[PDB]
Amino acid sequence: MKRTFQPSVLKRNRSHGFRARMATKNGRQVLARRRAKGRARLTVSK
């Protein structure tokens, strides 16, 4: 059966990537929270 995760690198990067996060203030607050938690990987970009 077709499951929910159908990968596409382009769609992944456009939806959740570093530049999408940076594009809006709420995305930038996502990045601020992840930097303050100390995540080794801020976004799906890497």
Added chain:
Amino acid sequence: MIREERLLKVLRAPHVSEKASTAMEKSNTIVLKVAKDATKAEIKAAVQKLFEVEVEVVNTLVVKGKVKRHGQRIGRRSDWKKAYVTLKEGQNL
């Protein structure tokens, strides 16, 4: 003109393997490890200046570093660039 300081940095080592030896003995091609940012033109000028041989053409490819485990800790070897440098038939390198 590409600088001598630039040319002295772009060739890192000869590459030693059976494919490299067969290339040298069959089609007059040397196999070199080169700087990852090196271009075919820089490689050509460097092999001509620093090995004093005439270069027909340079083919290049990027080698991806392998993921390895050291005492079951994950790391990754570096990527590097490999140059197939074809000489002009009488050059003796």
Added chain:
Amino acid sequence: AVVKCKPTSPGRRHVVKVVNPELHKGKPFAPLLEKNSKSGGRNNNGRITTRHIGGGHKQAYRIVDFKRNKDGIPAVVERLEYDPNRSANIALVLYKDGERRYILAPKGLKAGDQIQSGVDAAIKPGNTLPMRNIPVGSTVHNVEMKPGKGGQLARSAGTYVQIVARDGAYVTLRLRSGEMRKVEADCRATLGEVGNAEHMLRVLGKAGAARWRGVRPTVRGTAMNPVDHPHGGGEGRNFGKHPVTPWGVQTKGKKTRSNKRTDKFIVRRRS
């Protein structure tokens, strides 16, 4: 002409089509073509703002001259054409200086007919003039509501407006709706009726024919649940409420015209 389809399949049994052999069989005039991509009834918020719109055949927009502004230069009708964007047919006309335009095709207009616009034009179908030059009692179409703005009234197939009276700077028109409307006498109108009056005689015949025109299905409010529509609910077919729109406004008789700015121009409502 109007032609019934033979009942060789249930989806054909009730089809009635309007077939016009005078319509150009080939491609439209390329220099007056523009892309018009579809909306699905969604606005710039991405939300459906008009229900029941979507799909249907791809269409190219034909630049139609609703202003009829090339005063004093006669044109000759080259060919009548099918226009997917409207119910009327259009006519490709060639102006004596070499310019081509599309116009709404009026009743009786055919290839080789001569048309003209301006105060000096003869009173014959296809000619356009300010309504101050058109006799009282004429039948016109493509009527301007403001001078120089372009035709806006009586543009659908077979429609027309009657100039009923002239009083000063204004003409009074009987609109196809039945409404009596004042319009500046400088506003222009084209003589005659819009053509393709058989348009309304056609019978689509099947659901798919509505879908080809971009018309998606209408679900009745009483077929829904109370959370979706005021009519929703019931164990079985129940109604017992005053009929309303999906947003709760009465929909059998309640008036919605609210425009104090243009009331002055209405002499008598459509009735």
Added chain:
RNA sequence: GCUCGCCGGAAGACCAAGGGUUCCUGUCCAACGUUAAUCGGGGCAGGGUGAGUCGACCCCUAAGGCGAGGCCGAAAGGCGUAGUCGAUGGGAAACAGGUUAAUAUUCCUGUACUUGGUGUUACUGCGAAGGGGGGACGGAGAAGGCUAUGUUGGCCGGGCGACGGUUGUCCCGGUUUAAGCGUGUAGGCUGGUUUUCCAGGCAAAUCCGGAAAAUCAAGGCUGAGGCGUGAUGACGAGGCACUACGGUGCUGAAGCAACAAAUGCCCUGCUUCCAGGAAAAGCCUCUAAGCAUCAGGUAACAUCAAAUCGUACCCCAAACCGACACAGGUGGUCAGGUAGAGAAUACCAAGGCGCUUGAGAGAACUCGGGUGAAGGAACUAGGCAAAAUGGUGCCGUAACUUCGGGAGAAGGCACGCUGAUAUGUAGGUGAGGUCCCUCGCGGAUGGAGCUGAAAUCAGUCGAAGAUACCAGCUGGCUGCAACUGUUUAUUAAAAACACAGCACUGUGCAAACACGAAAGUGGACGUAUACGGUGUGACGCCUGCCCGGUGCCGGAAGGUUAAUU
């Protein structure tokens, strides 16, 4: 290694996406592998991905995104102009053979092609953020010409058979060859050329559009395939020679024809229909500012350049999505033989596999199947399940009907093989030859050779000839819904939803209405033969009475009545 078995419109092959070293070699067997493992997609070490032409990048735009100013909004922000991004689409160019343990349209051999930069020589009106052209576009259908490909014959090499026969009308194998360049063919479209004039193409135009005469009558554009060349080459059955028994080096025959033939090509064609079928750039052409024996354009020849990133391997799967080495899911391309209408189905080829526990036994019982005396729905909620029907041609077929249907109604007969008709028929294809020719890929006749249904008559074997696989059960009465569709992803597919059709009602355009504190946007680049809302639900015959209640519409006298004063 020999046998066996399974897939073969796949369980083969090549990819995209996704993954990321799983690829190859050596070595190890603790853990991982549902068993053992000497093996592995497992551990460890080393190796492996080579591009002017393939792809990305790049130029160009779609939906859409972002958006200088701007408009709007308590703030955050929303929308949007100029712009700028955004492929799933448009845009330059390479093929065949060989080679590695592992890459190849990338390396090598052979033979090509494209764009751009400079430098000569020659002829010159060049110039764009602009104008015009082109790019450039639907569904269905029909037919012709082709090729891929297959079959047979010829040819070439080999064979003479473990058991009766096999020098022949015998058996096995091979019979391949590209891009490029030349030729412009089947065929499609279009009249052509020269001058004059002009309210149009935001200005200009020699370009386009329009008008006028003169003149010629074929000019031009496009176009599969074939032929020639590429190629005195490559490959090539096989033979020989060694082999670390995995394979390597040498040598090299024939290498043709006829017939059949695509869903591929001509074909972005043609015909037809209505539901009327992207954009922009590259490209071509025209002028403006301007430059003006300069620059620059054209042409040939010469020289330089074409960077960078991807390229291993899986890819209907043990490598991707499903926690698994999981009977699931995953877009594109390739398409052999016999039989067959077929990409169904059976058996096979190329190729790939036997599904990572086995060995015995031959109880009940469960699962999946086969057969069954007599009976034949007695079973049961119900014929659930099962059994049965099943092909082609021809004969024949009722009520009812909206005249289309119903209908494959029902029902019945023939069907294999062999011989002749006719040593192979009707037909299809088509060489030599001849005749004409606006002389070539020409036309007219001519028909060798090849291929080849169906029928008739006679004979003949079996219990059975649509023999396997494959492949309608039929009829009678009646409810509901007109119909094809849609639906409760995962207990409901229906009589529910939708539907064409009908009706009421709103809406005069800055429309009603909807999203939105707003700007705006959709409705619609539509305009009452339109658009929204509501109910009904093809069609036929119809749709009666009630306005007292509630709603809506209209009224505007009188009473009551807010802020305010």
Added chain:
RNA sequence: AGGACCGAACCGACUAAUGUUGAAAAAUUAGCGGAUGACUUGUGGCUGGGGGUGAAAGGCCAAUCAAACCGGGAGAUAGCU
């Protein structure tokens, strides 16, 4: 010609059996419906939570839906166990 007919691919899901600590958190097997269309499919895009979308089942909106998910108010409150 056709929301025409029979029938593979393809899209579905009417019946039965199996399976129900499954091979599978919806499948398998034998049958079954559509199969030029209101068809189906790839890539990309838009609509966001009292919101979307809905040929309407309260269906669907990441195995979650009569108000998604994550974090917070938060140790809500719990005359109840």
